């Protein structure tokens, strides 16, 4: 499913993402936008052979198992296809572990390069939530 900005903002808030680990809502919406274009079905193949999945583009080398990425550690113990679902729960739950990893939202390159230090608030403005 392709989300709307506010539709995604509400779902993330309800799933407990607002200010999770210090990262306000605007950060998560901004990141989803540049990582997957609000598309739960997005996938991207990387050079090392792993693939990124879902709205938050969670990587198959450490976080999920896709049965084709060697050295796959599967930290959120879940098949990667569970992350392409229209119900963002699994992506949200796994996202929480990645952000608690110690590296913060720097784990998301699009966040680092396009959201870090911008008016991330603009992402949830005009939304009811």
XYZ file of C-alpha atoms in Angstrom:
129
model
C 0.000 0.000 0.000
C 1.059 3.555 -0.857
C 0.513 5.831 2.158
C -0.458 9.428 2.438
C 1.780 11.650 4.543
C -0.739 12.177 7.400
C -2.128 8.674 7.044
C 1.404 7.372 7.634
C 2.076 9.916 10.438
C -0.979 8.658 12.364
C -0.097 4.999 11.917
C 3.436 5.649 13.181
C 2.199 7.619 16.168
C -0.253 4.867 17.136
C 2.521 2.330 16.755
C 4.561 4.333 19.191
C 7.061 6.127 17.006
C 6.522 9.756 18.061
C 9.645 10.850 19.938
C 10.781 7.248 20.124
C 14.389 7.329 21.337
C 14.336 11.099 20.906
C 13.213 11.092 17.283
C 10.059 13.067 16.779
C 7.387 12.038 14.295
C 8.591 14.307 11.515
C 11.846 12.336 11.395
C 10.129 9.041 10.702
C 7.790 10.473 8.055
C 10.657 12.273 6.358
C 12.732 9.053 6.271
C 9.896 6.863 4.899
C 9.323 9.465 2.167
C 12.930 9.333 0.900
C 13.466 5.673 1.608
C 10.431 4.205 -0.057
C 8.114 6.974 -1.226
C 5.510 5.869 1.290
C 5.322 2.532 -0.504
C 5.142 -0.551 1.646
C 6.099 -2.795 -1.299
C 9.405 -1.124 -2.195
C 12.543 -3.221 -2.528
C 16.085 -2.287 -3.447
C 18.988 -4.546 -4.242
C 22.390 -3.592 -2.929
C 25.878 -4.362 -4.287
C 26.791 -6.645 -1.448
C 23.769 -8.708 -2.512
C 21.432 -7.868 0.317
C 18.110 -6.143 -0.394
C 16.200 -3.401 1.430
C 12.531 -3.946 2.194
C 9.488 -1.902 2.835
C 8.495 1.547 3.824
C 11.575 1.942 6.001
C 13.829 -0.118 3.686
C 15.089 -2.524 6.328
C 18.206 -4.408 5.199
C 18.340 -8.215 4.752
C 21.951 -8.652 5.902
C 21.160 -7.904 9.615
C 17.499 -7.370 10.229
C 15.351 -9.766 8.270
C 15.713 -13.086 6.484
C 14.978 -13.287 2.788
C 16.606 -16.623 2.185
C 19.219 -15.362 -0.276
C 21.514 -13.062 1.717
C 24.498 -14.949 3.170
C 25.629 -14.037 6.658
C 22.021 -13.007 7.209
C 21.741 -12.396 10.981
C 17.977 -11.826 11.036
C 17.904 -9.671 14.229
C 14.192 -8.862 14.163
C 13.627 -12.626 13.480
C 11.189 -12.172 10.645
C 10.999 -12.944 6.935
C 11.630 -9.823 4.843
C 8.266 -10.256 3.074
C 6.623 -9.513 6.399
C 7.988 -5.969 5.912
C 6.232 -5.374 2.583
C 2.855 -5.682 4.240
C 0.246 -2.896 4.179
C 0.194 -3.078 8.020
C 3.401 -1.348 9.072
C 3.576 -3.073 12.452
C 6.480 -5.424 11.709
C 8.460 -2.620 10.020
C 7.732 -0.372 12.970
C 8.723 -3.004 15.535
C 11.944 -3.831 13.716
C 12.602 -0.098 13.174
C 12.579 0.329 16.952
C 15.406 -2.195 17.350
C 17.512 -0.598 14.632
C 17.123 2.874 16.186
C 18.087 1.432 19.627
C 21.120 -0.168 18.021
C 23.298 2.683 19.223
C 23.673 4.346 15.811
C 20.298 6.096 15.977
C 18.494 7.051 12.805
C 21.916 7.338 11.129
C 21.194 3.766 10.104
C 19.049 5.331 7.399
C 21.198 6.995 4.784
C 18.250 8.959 3.374
C 17.601 10.280 6.888
C 21.216 11.227 7.370
C 21.481 12.991 4.001
C 17.999 14.452 3.593
C 16.222 14.698 6.975
C 18.922 15.221 9.583
C 18.775 18.897 10.565
C 15.851 20.193 8.494
C 12.411 21.352 9.547
C 11.152 17.759 9.974
C 8.005 19.264 11.541
C 6.832 20.262 8.102
C 6.126 16.570 7.505
C 3.179 16.295 9.898
C 1.770 19.806 9.576
C -1.821 19.980 8.508
C -2.370 16.518 9.784
C -4.821 15.615 12.526
C -3.118 12.341 13.607
